[PDB]
Write a protein that binds this DNA or RNA. Sequence first.
DNA 1: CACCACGTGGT
DNA 2: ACCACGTGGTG
Lengths: 80, 73
Amino acid sequence: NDDIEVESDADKRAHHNALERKRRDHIKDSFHSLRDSVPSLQGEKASRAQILDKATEYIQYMRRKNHTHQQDIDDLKRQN
Amino acid sequence: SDADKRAHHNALERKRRDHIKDSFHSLRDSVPSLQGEKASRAQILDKATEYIQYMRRKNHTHQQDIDDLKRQN
DNA sequence: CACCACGTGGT
DNA sequence: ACCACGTGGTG
């Protein structure tokens, strides 16, 4: 835009700031959705570090749980 | 002091930021869609959210296949 | 000592 | 598009 390039400094500042608010809101949102996707804290409190941490923890748990399910499938597929 | 008081507050936050930085790393590596890719913190959170949901689904259905192979056998 | 958001300055 | 810092305030 041709207005954008010729806009005032007050206009530049305000914008820079507005874009950062928007960036932070996206992330705050994304932390929300991760929070709710993880049953160890489905929808209560939890600091950003806990969300990231319990999220890594869950992924590992699930993997363990998955290796266990697929064996019991193979072995039930032996019986069947 | 009142000055030395501020240095500490600041030092403790730097620590907070480092914890979150490291934790983003590990989450990054635990998600196969992000391995080897350059990702923004928003991507990591988003692609992670995606994976965790996928895993939950896929595990659930595999449970079903157990019940039905258990209802079959 | 944890937590958090903001404005700002730096690619 | 994105990121890290210092800050002021909360428990």
